[PDB]
Design a protein around this ligand. Structure first.
Ligand SMILES: *C(=O)CCCC[C@@H]1SC[C@@H]2NC(=O)N[C@@H]21
Ligand SMILES: *C(=O)CCCC[C@@H]1SC[C@@H]2NC(=O)N[C@@H]21
Lengths: 728, 220, 137, 64
């Protein structure tokens, strides 16, 4: 392909195929020549390497961008090769660092351009070195380094690495050609082409996320030295035998014959540096697009059974299309229509039938049920029922779906259940997410029951454009379904691990305690005032407003607070935190006024969007239901509750009474009566409890676990002073 | 024998929502609610009934005629999914017999089955169907829109319609004439286009034969 | 209607030590409950209070409404083995032993018709002197 | 089933006899399980269950 600055020689290559199978592998190759005189280093070649690396990388990406958009062959694995003529004196490790930083900072553009491999040739001092980079899924960059060694018996030259991490090309010939994709590719490519990660890349993400976790928590607690990455995570794949039972198997990735995959993972975390277990279940989006079948359902069930039997968490990665459907194609090409008028077909038909020639070839399969009739002087087998010889498309998928739904409902009440939504979930998939009640939703993913196209067909006009209008973040995160939103799959995995760091390793274990770097014996530097304030300031603390540095400390350990369900029912704040290294669930009350924005349904042209002012220190239907959800979820999670109670009562207006405030207020009581962990209610300063808001959190509900404490600047009664003087 | 009763409305109803007098910018609204659909309110009512009758100690007789859940923006915003889950959690705790019967001219489709399926509580729940009943994941229209699009409909017409067959066979003769081939092609286009609605009805009938209770009985 | 009145500035420390106490108490209370699931809450709490006084002494009985001190004592009873041996564990074991004994007696007395079907098996894995007592009486 | 459940002192409901057999064996298994899992109590209950017995049963206890 010609281009400007033709030192960057671009080629488009198509894999050689036989006269049978067509061509599906197309790849760009950038082959560049960098001419320059040799360098003498006095620690003065760093700028050369950095500047040339950056300049050449940017030029490569730019030329490739132009040529990539000029054609449509849908390439996958683009490659860049930079051959540097001059010799440089430098330690190879420093070159590694330089290339690493340059690639990472521009990793996003390389990802968009599908640049997965890169090679750099450069001479040291002179001995050649060859840097080989693999940059797949955008969380991890792999850099290898090899020397070319000629000490062979023939004229062939081969690579020799440095002993530490020899790598795949160790002892390989330097003239090895480029291959034409593999087992994992052409499935990994499809999955990434849908905006989701391939299933068999999930374990690796966990490992890398754990690394980040061990770094992230280093500012909160006194942690031991982390183990090497090779000892942080080990897993075994869970497969089905011929009977339907689980087998622990170690095999290469990409060998799944069904659309569901599961693993048992053991890993070391800062809070449990001896190993904790989890079960991970995931949909393969590329296997018969999404689509729960009977075997996928069975594997889901058996893995969930395992998790309950061991009492450990269950993680579900949702990327599916709902229940599997199909049509009996063996009949589709055989049936004939019995017309009312065979010459004028527009006066109806009476039935569909098979001729004997077709019926005799299917009657032995139990694929169709017909009855013999004589009509129009012909022998016909009138179709009354179609069964289908193919299994996994019929009503058996309804049963199976219901089956696993029940399992999820049980699992939530025995173990930890966490769900991550990476691509999409339709129908049963959404329910499977919901029944876990702990949902992480990636940006540009949706949870729906009915697609936009179906709804447009039903309603008769193009009402909806995108499925994100039906189940995207702007709905699911604001109505209380999604707890947390993340930008990509990797952040989602990280969030899962982050949440797990607060809770027991198993249902039979205590809460994990950390040796915190925030002293317990300090005081709280932020004082709640009489005027409205952000409840987060007392929970976590705030930047010292007087100065530029200096953080004013809050009640809980610095940096430990993590809020969930933030934009839903914003009059109440719920989250997780640590007190002296002790994980707790947190409930708190907003005292500022908030604005609830309600969108307009595009299917009702007479609807309007509305803004409703919600005052603080009030229980509304939404905030009451949110509080119930938090209480129930933390009771199942296994954490004590710390409640900062500042409610002046329930809303008694017509619209909140119509919207069932009383029901949710009752649910709060029923939630607290089933607590098994300590529940500590504290009335902060300049806070009050009045009337209905007391009787629903009173310690008499669950006397064994509940306690109430008050500050000196607190108040509590049935009626506020004004309401008392108006009577007495 | 006393029983709890759940049944489905098939007529359209009007939900009247009042205006709050404390918000002078509010308005009363009338919303049309179709039958054979689960809305947030009706799903929650069903959950309440199930839970209440379980505690009361009565068996349940369910006359199930739901075509699925509402997937529109406003019902998704008003938490239809949550209440749909509550139905499952309610049925899992039944201790009395639960008998689901699909009446005649009734159907269960997709999401509405998987929440009342007998697999939730196998010890107590049973399902029965009439002969005039239907049950599947997707209605026939939604199935043909996926598996029986126009291309396959034309392929069907290729082996059925005598007129289209005669024209297609005539055009298959080598080297008739330019003008005749053009005329035959236009005749084929007009005939195949003219026959789409009738073969569409045929297609959905074909798909309907997959949703019968005979199949459900064979599959168990 | 409330347990105490606290100061805001020092609430962090108070609630830390209180929660620590309550969690340790939950551990030991669960052990007690498993030893005799037919006990109620007042009985369990009374057992813990009495054991604390009996072991430490009556002069130290005031050291109960002190979350730090009592948490440390409970931790020592729960975390240390093959050593101090955790006297509280011995009392819990006493409860468990007597409870299973009561179940045995209850079942045979409520249903004498099985008394002679189990009488053999429980006189097998015994010392010969125990068998001599069985024969003698 | 109604005949087995509603009629007493009469047909005597054979199904009730089978249920009673189950109940008897279950409590027996519980007794054995507790003593075998915890031999240290075996001789504390051995006396009480040899009190409300026939003299021939006591003779069997002594003999064996
Ligand atoms: C604030 O001081 C108390 C607010 C109580 C609720 C108010 S009263 C009228 C409005 N209607 C409604 O539903 N909530 C609002
Ligand atoms: C009837 O055929 C199906 C009704 C599905 C719900 C409809 S679609 C658009 C409207 N918005 C909404 O929330 N519900 C209505």
């Amino acid at each position: 392909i010609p281009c400007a600055n033709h030192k960057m020689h671009l080629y488009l290559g198509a894999a050689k195929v036989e006269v049978g199978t067509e061509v599906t592998d197309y790849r760009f190759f950038v082959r560049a020549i960098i001419r320059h005189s040799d360098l003498v280093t006095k620690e003065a070649s760093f700028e050369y390497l950095q500047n040339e690396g950056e300049r050449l990388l940017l030029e490569a990406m730019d030329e490739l961008e132009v040529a990539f958009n000029n054609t449509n062959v849908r390439t996958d694995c683009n490659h860049i090769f930079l051959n540097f003529v001059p010799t440089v004196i430098m330690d190879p490790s420093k070159i590694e660092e330089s290339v690493r930083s340059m690639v990472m900072r521009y990793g996003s553009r390389l990802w968009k351009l599908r640049v997965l491999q890169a090679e750099l040739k450069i001479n040291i001092r002179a001995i050649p070195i060859r840097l080989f980079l693999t940059n797949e899924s955008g969380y991890y960059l792999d850099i290898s380094l090899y020397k070319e060694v000629t000490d062979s018996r023939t004229a062939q030259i081969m690579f020799q690495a440095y002993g530490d991490k020899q790598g795949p090309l160790h002892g390989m010939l330097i003239n090895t050609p480029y291959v034409t994709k593999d087992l994992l590719q052409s499935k990994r490519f499809q999955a990434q082409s849908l905006g989701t990660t391939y299933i068999y890349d999930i374990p690796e993400m966990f490992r890398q996320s754990l690394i980040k976790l061990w770094e992230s928590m280093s500012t909160q607690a006194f942690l031991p030295s982390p183990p090497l990455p090779s000892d942080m995570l080990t897993y075994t794949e869970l497969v089905l035998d011929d009977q339907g039972q689980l087998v622990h198997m170690n095999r290469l990735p990409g060998g799944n014959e069904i659309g569901m995959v599961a693993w048992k993972m053991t890993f070391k975390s800062p809070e449990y540096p001896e190993g904790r277990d989890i079960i991970v279940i995931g949909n393969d989006i590329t296997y018969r697009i999404g689509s729960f079948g009977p075997q996928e359902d069975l594997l889901f069930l058996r893995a969930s059974e395992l998790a309950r039997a061991e009492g450990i968490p269950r993680i579900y990665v949702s990327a599916n299309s709902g229940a599997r459907i199909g049509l009996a194609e063996e009949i589709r090409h055989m049936f004939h229509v019995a017309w009312v008028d065979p010459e004028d077909p527009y006066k109806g038909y009476r039935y569909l039938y098979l001729t004997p020639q077709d019926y005799k070839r299917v009657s032995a399969l139990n694929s169709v049920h017909c009855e013999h009739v004589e009509d129009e002087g012909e022998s016909r087998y009138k179709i009354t029922d179609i069964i289908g010889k193919e299994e996994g498309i019929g009503p058996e998928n309804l049963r199976g779906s219901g089956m696993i739904a029940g399992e999820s409902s049980l699992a939530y009440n025995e173990i930890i259940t966490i769900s991550l939504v990476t691509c999409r979930a339709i129908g049963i998939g959404a329910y499977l997410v919901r029944l876990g009640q702990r949902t992480i939703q990636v940006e540009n993913s949706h949870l729906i029951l009915t697609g936009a196209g179906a709804l447009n067909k039903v309603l008769g006009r193009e009402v909806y454009t995108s499925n994100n209008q039906l189940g995207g973040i702007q709905i699911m995160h604001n109505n209380g379904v999604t707890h947390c939103t993340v930008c990509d799959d990797f952040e989602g995995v990280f969030t899962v691990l982050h949440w797990l760091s607060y809770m027991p390793k198993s249902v039979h274990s205590s809460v994990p305690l950390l040796n915190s770097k925030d002293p317990i014996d300090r005081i709280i530097e932020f004082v709640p005032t009489k005027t409205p304030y952000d409840p987060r300031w007392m929970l976590a603390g705030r930047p010292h407003p007087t100065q530029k540095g200096q953080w004013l400390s809050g009640f809980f350990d610095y940096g430990s607070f993590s809020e969930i369900m933030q934009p839903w029912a914003q009059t109440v704040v719920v989250g997780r935190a640590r007190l002296g290294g002790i994980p707790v669930g947190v409930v708190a009350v907003e005292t500022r006024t908030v604005e609830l924005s309600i969108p307009a349904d595009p299917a009702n042209l007479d609807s309007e969007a509305k803004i409703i002012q919600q005052a603080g220190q009030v229980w509304f239907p939404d905030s009451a239901f949110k509080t119930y959800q938090a209480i129930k979820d933390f009771n199942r999670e296994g954490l004590p509750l710390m409640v900062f109670a500042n409610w002046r009562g329930f809303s008694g207006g017509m619209k909140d009474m119509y919207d069932q405030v009383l029901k949710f207020g009752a649910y709060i009581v029923d939630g607290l009566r089933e607590c098994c962990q300590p529940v500590l209610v504290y009335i902060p300063p300049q806070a009050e409890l009045r009337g209905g808001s007391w009787v629903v959190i009173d310690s008499s509900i669950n006397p064994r676990h509940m306690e109430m404490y008050a500050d000196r600047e607190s108040r509590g009664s049935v009626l506020e002073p004004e309401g008392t003087v108006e009577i007495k | 024998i006393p029983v709890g009763v759940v049944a489905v409305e098939t007529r359209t109803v009007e939900l009247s929502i009042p205006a709050d007098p404390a918000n002078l910018d509010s308005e009363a609204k009338i919303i049309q609610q179709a039958g054979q659909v689960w809305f947030p309110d009706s799903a929650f009512k069903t959950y309440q009934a199930i839970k209440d009758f379980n505690r009361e100690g009565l068996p349940l007789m369910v006359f199930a005629n739901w075509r699925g859940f509402s997937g529109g923006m406003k019902d998704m915003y008003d938490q239809v999914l949550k209440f749909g889950a509550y139905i499952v959690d309610g049925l899992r705790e039944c201790c009395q017999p639960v008998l689901v019967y699909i009446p005649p001219q009734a159907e269960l489709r997709g999401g509405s089955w998987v929440v009342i399926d007998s697999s939730i509580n196998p010890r107590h729940m049973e399902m029965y169907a009439d002969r005039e009943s239907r049950g599947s994941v997707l209605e026939p229209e939604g199935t043909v829109e996926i598996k029986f699009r126009r291309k396959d409909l034309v392929k069907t017409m290729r082996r059925v319609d005598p007129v289209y067959i005669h024209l297609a066979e005539r055009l298959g003769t080598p080297e008739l004439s330019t003008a005749e081939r053009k005329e035959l092609e236009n005749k084929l286009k007009e005939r195949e286009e003219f026959l789409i609605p009738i073969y569409h009805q045929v297609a959905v009938q074909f798909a309907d034969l997959h949703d019968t209770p005979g199949r459900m009985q064979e599959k168990g | 209607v409330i347990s105490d009145i606290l100061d805001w500035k020092t609430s962090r420390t108070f609630f830390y030590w209180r929660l620590r106490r309550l969690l340790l108490e939950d551990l030991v209370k669960k052990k007690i409950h498993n030893a005799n699931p037919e006990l109620t809450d007042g009985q369990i709490q009374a057992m813990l209070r009495r054991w604390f006084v009996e072991v430490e002494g009556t002069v130290k009985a005031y050291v109960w409404d002190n979350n730090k001190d009592l948490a440390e004592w409970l931790e020592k009873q729960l975390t240390e083995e093959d050593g101090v041996h955790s006297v509280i564990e011995e009392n819990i074991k006493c409860i468990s032993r007597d409870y299973v004994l009561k179940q045995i007696r209850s079942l045979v007395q409520a249903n004498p018709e099985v008394a002679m079907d189990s009488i053999i098996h429980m006189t097998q894995h015994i010392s010969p002197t125990q068998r001599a007592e069985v024969i003698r009486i």
